[PDB]
Design a protein around this nucleic acid. Structure first.
Ligand SMILES: [Mg+2]
Ligand SMILES: [Mg+2]
Ligand SMILES: [Mg+2]
Ligand SMILES: [Mg+2]
Ligand SMILES: [Mg+2]
Ligand SMILES: [Mg+2]
Ligand SMILES: [Mg+2]
Ligand SMILES: [Mg+2]
Ligand SMILES: [Mg+2]
Ligand SMILES: [Mg+2]
Ligand SMILES: [Mg+2]
Ligand SMILES: [Mg+2]
Ligand SMILES: [Mg+2]
Ligand SMILES: [Mg+2]
Ligand SMILES: [Mg+2]
Ligand SMILES: [Mg+2]
Ligand SMILES: [Mg+2]
Ligand SMILES: [Mg+2]
Ligand SMILES: [Mg+2]
Ligand SMILES: [Mg+2]
Ligand SMILES: [Mg+2]
Ligand SMILES: [Mg+2]
Ligand SMILES: [Mg+2]
Ligand SMILES: [Mg+2]
Ligand SMILES: [Mg+2]
Ligand SMILES: [Mg+2]
Ligand SMILES: [Mg+2]
Ligand SMILES: [Mg+2]
Ligand SMILES: [Mg+2]
Ligand SMILES: [Mg+2]
Ligand SMILES: [Mg+2]
Ligand SMILES: [Mg+2]
Ligand SMILES: [Mg+2]
Ligand SMILES: [Mg+2]
Ligand SMILES: [Mg+2]
Ligand SMILES: [Mg+2]
Ligand SMILES: [Mg+2]
Ligand SMILES: [Mg+2]
Ligand SMILES: [Mg+2]
Ligand SMILES: [Mg+2]
Ligand SMILES: [Mg+2]
Ligand SMILES: [Mg+2]
Ligand SMILES: [Mg+2]
Ligand SMILES: [Mg+2]
Ligand SMILES: [Mg+2]
Ligand SMILES: [Mg+2]
Ligand SMILES: [Mg+2]
Ligand SMILES: [Mg+2]
Ligand SMILES: [Mg+2]
Ligand SMILES: [Mg+2]
Ligand SMILES: [Mg+2]
Ligand SMILES: [Mg+2]
Ligand SMILES: [Mg+2]
Ligand SMILES: [Mg+2]
Ligand SMILES: [Mg+2]
Ligand SMILES: [Mg+2]
Ligand SMILES: [Mg+2]
Ligand SMILES: [Mg+2]
Ligand SMILES: [Mg+2]
Ligand SMILES: [Mg+2]
Ligand SMILES: [Mg+2]
Ligand SMILES: [Mg+2]
Lengths: 138, 181, 111, 80, 45, 66
RNA sequence: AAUCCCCCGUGCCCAUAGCGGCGUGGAACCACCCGUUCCCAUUCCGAACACGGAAGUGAAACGCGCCAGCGCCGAUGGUACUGGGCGGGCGACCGCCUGGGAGAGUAGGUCGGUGCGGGGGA
RNA sequence: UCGCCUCCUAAAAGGUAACGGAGGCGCCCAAAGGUCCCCUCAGGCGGGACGGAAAUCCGCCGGAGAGCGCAAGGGUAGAAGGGGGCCUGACUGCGAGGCCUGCAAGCCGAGCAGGGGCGAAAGCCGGGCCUAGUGAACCGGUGGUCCCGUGUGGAAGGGCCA
RNA sequence: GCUGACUGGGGCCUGUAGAGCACUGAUAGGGCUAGGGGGCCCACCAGCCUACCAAACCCUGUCAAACUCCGAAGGGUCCCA
RNA sequence: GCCCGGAUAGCUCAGUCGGUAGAGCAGGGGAUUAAAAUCCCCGUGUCCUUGGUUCGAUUCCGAGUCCGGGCACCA
RNA sequence: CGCGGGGUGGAGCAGCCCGGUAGCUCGUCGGGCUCAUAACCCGAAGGUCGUCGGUUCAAAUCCGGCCCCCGCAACCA
RNA sequence: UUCGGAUUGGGGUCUGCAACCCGACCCCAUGAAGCCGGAAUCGCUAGUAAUCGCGGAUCAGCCAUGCCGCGGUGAAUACG
């Protein structure tokens, strides 16, 4: 689905969405990227919604990178009220300026119209990008 | 005794051959031979601690040293083995007593091994020491065959100052170690 | 293999001595000679020295040692030094090192 | 168990740490540092009790010493 | 198993712990008394 | 060597299919060895007695005369 | 005697002293080395520790150099964050002032420095 | 669920809540204690009869990832870890001065005296690497001792120390 | 009866924000490779191919209250004003 | 804390005028015309432990180990 | 959701408590007796212990997660 | 095991057009299971049962330990 195997701890505190993406952010694997303009918990099921929209969009062809991963467990109570925490029930924290997704090996006009679909499945505003000198060398 | 025929054979005619072959700026650089360590691993006597001191009596007789006993490092389930117990005898012999033992080994023991088309030459350990092991203990002259209750073999470690296998081979060859080539 | 047995026991006995905080009567002994040097730490400083080298004596290395002890006491006591602690370094207290130390009383002491 | 709550414990805080800082005047006996491992070793005129606890041996002032991979050190300087 | 050990005289003692089936013996060791100085001290009662 | 607990290890003589090995210096002097290989029977000082490989050799030999 | 240089101790800074490669040293120090009588040793072994030595060797170890492949150290500039003072946004969060200011990274650095004492040359 | 220990929450002193997130204790050891002396891990690669992923042995590499009786943390081979010899300081009489703290408790503690242990000594030694392994007081039991002893001598019963 | 909050200077203590991936874990893409998933040639040790399994290892790229090679601003405390 | 009763080869156990050890279902062997029962033979069981009593001790004195019932007590 | 019990050869049930050893009935397989089948007799085979993790030298056994099973409960409203 | 000779290695002999599949026999080597057989079950009343050898038919040869016969020695036990 997308999810770790093996966790150290089952549940973990919410924390803030403060700041800028802190890495990720420079477009390392592909010809075109999708970058986050807003912070959000992006869900294993939103990610896979986007991934499939793109493969469906081209031919089973192309190449797709993803590059954000849902390692943060997301609890919810049932309709109860208050005794303990839990349960269940996975997100990836995503700050502004991060490259998620990022396709390659496809025509610009394909990638861009697929990346546009892809971001319609996301809770945040997004930006399509290309690739650069600015994405350096390393 | 400081004489010991093999010791000699090493000094007169093994050393020079080695200097002639590899060629050596220094007297020390030419391989010496230190430490034959003999070691019997015996799970055989584990719950019986009596059987052991017979094996150490046997090892003494052929070595001329009483071995000390090795005891189990960690505890392992699958074959018995509390982390206490004696696993086997191990004797270090050097310096003369070493020699007088290797002589006997070359000229009597291995000859007495059933089959024996020769010592395996892949047992060199890559930094230039050599190891081998024997199935039965009665291939030695000091063992009378009526003093065997049960067969136990051992592991022999020939340690050498030779930095490499090649040189180490040469040393031992020249000393009369029969090799399967 | 890092940091040998020699250098462990080396440190081991120094450290213990160095806590009590006396002057240190340190002993180096080579296969040829035996030297002894009385140090005050926290100044990092040597005060009295004695060697089988600078005394140029020989024969029976132990007996040579008893002497370089008396040699140290005598020179040392001359500056007021009486109490110190025997470093013994990485050496068993025995033989040559024992001998220098039991030759280092008659003079400043407790060894 | 799992749900109701299996958690809920914690122990009392141990009020651990440094109790005298550099150049504070102390007296023989004052404990200087309260600590778990050997996190500061005893220095000049400084004792260590069986709970790893460091005290002044003498009246004086406390100096701190960072000896690199020899760890950190607390001494008391007399003029006691 | 709480431990109680007299010496020989004056029956006052000093107090110990061995909860256990060894040492199981007379359980005796040298101690200082309030009595005179440093006698033999055997376990009891 | 710790004095006690020990085999004597005194000079010896010793025997074989060969003559004596003067070397000895062993426990328990005057030992008789069954046979050695070195002394050159049985392998070294290669005798190659009794020698094998005859069984590919044979099938071709008495064969086509008959 | 100061000064310098080499060695031997022994401190200190605590890897800019490290690893690896290479080279070099035996007169003197030092080591390995000769032996196991004696003191003393090995859960077996004079390996180690110990003694009595002095024929040989700087092979090992140690010391001294030189190499930046690794390791270690590492700016300046710019950001992040932030004491204090103000704004903006439904929110998540964001910006301005003034003061403090990393981490990663880039440029580089580095094959140590040094105190006391001896021994020897100066 | 209720006392105790470890971690996080806890906002780089201490402290800090919730039917917040996770685990442990109610023991254990006459050696798992004191001292003197010695020794140094785990792992990996290579070699070695029965021996296998692992028993024991030999080589090189391996600054600690192992070990430290048990949870976790901190610590730790320049030992707190592993082996051995002597031993019982897992002493008695006290205790300068502090940590902590509403009280009462808890905790560390140099130093002096009596008599000892190990060590050539310097010295260390008032249990255990440390932080849980525990329970005011009142009632009473048992051992000792000097103290009290209802006219007096005893006894009854108390006190005091354990 | 000048010691106070506050403030200036100086020392020491700390492990948060930020960041990092050296530890503990998680983790995307690729490479190289143990064991095998056995296509099988075996059905003798063999035994090669892997657009599947894969440790470690290299390269790119990330995440963490109970991770830290690092680490501010501030905060505490003592001295002198 | 108590007193007492129970502890036996493989199981149940039955057995103290003290000098020797025992029986049924088991186990095995052997017979029994179909497969039970019923017949005939052999098992340290060191009879609940240690020191002590005399020739002798399952069985006698000092401590105990374990088990029950009915009592006790419990700051 | 909540508390309590369970999951082991084909079937039903022990063993888990107290770490090392998996047993009982039935079924199944091979022989026998019978003209034959059943009954009956003599032999045998067969479980990794729901599952994933952890503790230990060692886990059916001790601990945690998840998955099914059975039972209890769900009141003043 | 000087018991017992199954298996296997090598070497040959004879018949036969031909002995790989599938022959019998000789020699060297190899020497397996087997220490009187669970439940069960067969034969035999006298020259029988046991035990020992011999011939023949078929047939080139032969897997014959089979079958049909021949004699040597030679028991036990039947209350009922
Ligand atoms: Mg980055
Ligand atoms: Mg959401
Ligand atoms: Mg409600
Ligand atoms: Mg959108
Ligand atoms: Mg090799
Ligand atoms: Mg070598
Ligand atoms: Mg806490
Ligand atoms: Mg560093
Ligand atoms: Mg020289
Ligand atoms: Mg020379
Ligand atoms: Mg050299
Ligand atoms: Mg940097
Ligand atoms: Mg800067
Ligand atoms: Mg601000
Ligand atoms: Mg920087
Ligand atoms: Mg360097
Ligand atoms: Mg220096
Ligand atoms: Mg000089
Ligand atoms: Mg932490
Ligand atoms: Mg805090
Ligand atoms: Mg704070
Ligand atoms: Mg704080
Ligand atoms: Mg609990
Ligand atoms: Mg290893
Ligand atoms: Mg190996
Ligand atoms: Mg550790
Ligand atoms: Mg821990
Ligand atoms: Mg631990
Ligand atoms: Mg820890
Ligand atoms: Mg000890
Ligand atoms: Mg004594
Ligand atoms: Mg006080
Ligand atoms: Mg108080
Ligand atoms: Mg004290
Ligand atoms: Mg005293
Ligand atoms: Mg003494
Ligand atoms: Mg009351
Ligand atoms: Mg009372
Ligand atoms: Mg009176
Ligand atoms: Mg009266
Ligand atoms: Mg009266
Ligand atoms: Mg009274
Ligand atoms: Mg004022
Ligand atoms: Mg300040
Ligand atoms: Mg953060
Ligand atoms: Mg990491
Ligand atoms: Mg953090
Ligand atoms: Mg830095
Ligand atoms: Mg003022
Ligand atoms: Mg029956
Ligand atoms: Mg059937
Ligand atoms: Mg039937
Ligand atoms: Mg489970
Ligand atoms: Mg397991
Ligand atoms: Mg009601
Ligand atoms: Mg109602
Ligand atoms: Mg309603
Ligand atoms: Mg055929
Ligand atoms: Mg027989
Ligand atoms: Mg039969
Ligand atoms: Mg015929
Ligand atoms: Mg016939």
């Amino acid at each position: 689905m997308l999810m770790p195997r093996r966790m150290k701890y089952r549940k973990q505190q919410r924390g803030r969405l403060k700041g800028a993406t802190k890495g990720g952010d420079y477009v390392a694997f592909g010809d075109y990227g999708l970058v986050a303009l807003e912070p959000a918990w992006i869900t294993a099921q939103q990610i896979e919604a986007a991934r499939v929209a793109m493969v469906r969009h081209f031919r089973r062809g192309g190449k797709i990178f993803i590059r954000i991963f849902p390692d943060k467990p997301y609890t919810k109570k049932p309709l109860e009220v208050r005794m303990g925490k839990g349960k269940g029930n996975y997100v990836a924290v995503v700050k502004p300026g991060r490259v998620m997704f990022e396709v390659a090996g496809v025509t610009e006009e394909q990638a861009m119209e697929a990346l546009r679909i892809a971001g319609h499945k996301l809770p945040i505003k997004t930006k399509i990008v290309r690739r650069d000198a600015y994405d350096e060398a390393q | 005794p400081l004489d010991v025929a093999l010791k000699r054979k090493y000094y007169e005619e093994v050393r020079p051959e080695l200097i002639r072959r590899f060629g050596y700026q220094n007297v020390w650089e030419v391989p010496r031979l230190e430490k034959v360590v003999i070691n019997q691993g015996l799970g055989e006597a584990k719950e019986d601690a009596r059987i052991l001191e017979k094996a150490a009596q046997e090892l003494a007789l052929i070595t001329g040293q009483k071995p000390a006993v090795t005891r189990a490092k960690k505890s392992i389930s699958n074959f018995k083995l509390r982390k206490g117990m004696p696993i086997g005898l191990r004797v270090t012999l050097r310096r003369d007593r070493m020699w007088i033992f290797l002589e006997k080994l070359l000229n009597v023991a291995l000859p007495r091994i059933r089959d024996f088309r020769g010592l395996n030459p892949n047992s060199f350990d890559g930094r230039g020491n050599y190891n081998l092991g024997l199935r039965e203990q009665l291939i030695f002259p000091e063992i009378t065959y009526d003093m065997v209750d049960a067969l136990r073999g051992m592991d022999i470690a020939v340690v050498t100052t030779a930095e490499t296998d090649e040189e180490a081979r040469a040393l031992l060859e020249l000393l009369g170690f029969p090799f399967r080539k | 293999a890092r940091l040998t047995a020699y250098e462990r026991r080396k440190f081991r006995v120094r450290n213990r001595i160095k806590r009590t905080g006396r002057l240190r009567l340190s002993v180096f002994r080579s296969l040829k000679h035996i030297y002894a040097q009385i140090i005050d730490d926290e100044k990092g400083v040597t005060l009295v020295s004695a060697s089988s080298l600078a005394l140029k004596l020989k024969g029976n290395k132990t007996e040579v040692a008893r002497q370089v002890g008396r040699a140290l006491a005598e020179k040392a006591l001359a500056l007021g030094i009486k109490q110190v602690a025997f470093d013994r370094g990485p050496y068993k207290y025995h033989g040559r090192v024992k001998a220098l130390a039991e030759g280092a009383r008659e003079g400043g002491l407790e060894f | 168990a799992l749900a109701s709550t299996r958690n809920g414990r914690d122990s009392q805080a141990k009020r651990l740490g440094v109790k005298r800082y550099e150049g504070q005047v102390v007296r023989a006996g004052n404990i200087l540092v309260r600590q778990r491992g050997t996190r500061f070793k005893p220095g000049k005129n400084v004792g260590m009790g069986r709970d790893f606890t460091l005290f002044a041996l003498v009246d004086g002032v406390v100096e701190f010493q960072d000896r690199g991979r020899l760890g950190r050190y607390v001494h008391v300087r007399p003029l006691a | 198993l709480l431990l109680e050990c007299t010496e020989c005289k004056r029956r006052n003692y000093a107090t110990e712990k061995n909860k256990r089936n060894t040492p199981n013996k007379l359980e005796l060791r040298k101690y200082c008394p309030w009595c005179r100085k440093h006698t033999v001290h055997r376990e009891v009662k | 060597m710790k004095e006690g607990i020990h085999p004597k290890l005194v000079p010896a003589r010793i025997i074989c299919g060969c003559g004596n090995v003067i070397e000895t210096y062993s426990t328990k002097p005057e030992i008789y060895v069954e046979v050695c290989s070195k002394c050159h029977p049985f392998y070294t000082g290669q005798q190659r007695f009794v020698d094998t490989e005859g069984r590919v050799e044979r099938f071709q030999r008495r064969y086509g005369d008959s």
